[PDB]
Amino acid sequence: PGFQKITLSSSSEEYQKVWNLFNRTLPFYFVQKIERVQNLALWEVYQWQKGQMQKQNGGKAVDERQLFHGTSAIVVDGICQHNFDWRVCGTSYGKGSYFARDAAYSHHFSKSDTQTHTMFLARVLVGEFVRGNASFVRPPAKEGWSNAFYDSCVNSVSDPSIFVIFEKHQVYPEYVIQYTTS
């Protein structure tokens, strides 16, 4: 309705860039399809959010990453339209949407009763992160009154592999990847 999914050719740069990231940690699985998600509304919001975060970061570029999110085929179109939402879908670093450095992590949270799975690659404004906590419903504030708040939570500040996002405006669902464990 407000989005399109464009199937990419395996001979394209774009396909192979996405494939490369997946293959970093799931070389033993087989990618069957990659689709580019085009949602102008979600894109406009995301780019605005990025601009606002840059201003609030003393005018410096925002930490922005391409991160994986395990899904199921049935919820793909809902995400493409409305964005990710944590209260639709292990160790908790807060009550937000989880995004992983590694596809292999996302594979663990990708629900299927068959060998065929789906995950997103998403563009994520992680900004300034802090270690999360099961009780967090938003990123905490830094010490001191009306000081800065963080932008995301992580499992580890020194070696972050999981990012928790509490604001949909910080995510753009970029690619849908279908693969098999066969």
UniProtKB/Swiss-Prot annotation:
Annotated PARP catalytic domain residues: 1-182
Q: What is the effect of changing residue 69 to A?
A: Catalytically inactive mutant
Q: How is it modified after translation?
A: Auto-mono-ADP-ribosylated. Phosphorylated by PRKD1.
GO MF assignments: NAD+ poly-ADP-ribosyltransferase activity; NAD+-protein mono-ADP-ribosyltransferase activity; NAD+-protein-aspartate ADP-ribosyltransferase activity; NAD+-protein-cysteine ADP-ribosyltransferase activity; nucleotidyltransferase activity; RNA binding; zinc ion binding
Residue numbers bearing the ADP-ribosyl aspartic acid modification: 102, 113
Q: Which UniProt keywords apply?
A: ADP-ribosylation, Cytoplasm, Glycosyltransferase, Golgi apparatus, Metal-binding, NAD, Nucleotidyltransferase, Nucleus, Phosphoprotein, Repeat, Transferase, Zinc, Zinc-finger
* Compartments where located: Nucleus; Golgi apparatus, trans-Golgi network; Cytoplasm, Stress granule
For this record, the Gene Ontology CC terms, alphabetical, are: nucleus
Q: Name one GO biological process term.
A: protein auto-ADP-ribosylation
Assembly mode: Interacts with PARP11; this interaction plays a key role in zika virus suppression. Interacts with ISG15.
Its biological function? Answer: Mono-ADP-ribosyltransferase that mediates mono-ADP-ribosylation of target proteins. Acts as an antiviral factor by cooperating with PARP11 to suppress Zika virus replication. Displays anti-alphavirus activity during IFN-gamma immune activation by directly ADP-ribosylating the alphaviral non-structural proteins nsP3 and nsP4. Acts as a component of the PRKD1-driven regulatory cascade that selectively controls a major branch of the basolateral transport pathway by catalyzing the MARylation of GOLGA1. Acts also as a key regulator of mitochondrial function, protein translation, and inflammation.
Q: Which family does it belong to?
A: Belongs to the ARTD/PARP family.
Q: What is this protein called?
A: Protein mono-ADP-ribosyltransferase PARP12
What's the name of its gene? PARP12
Full-protein interval shown: 496 to 680 of 701
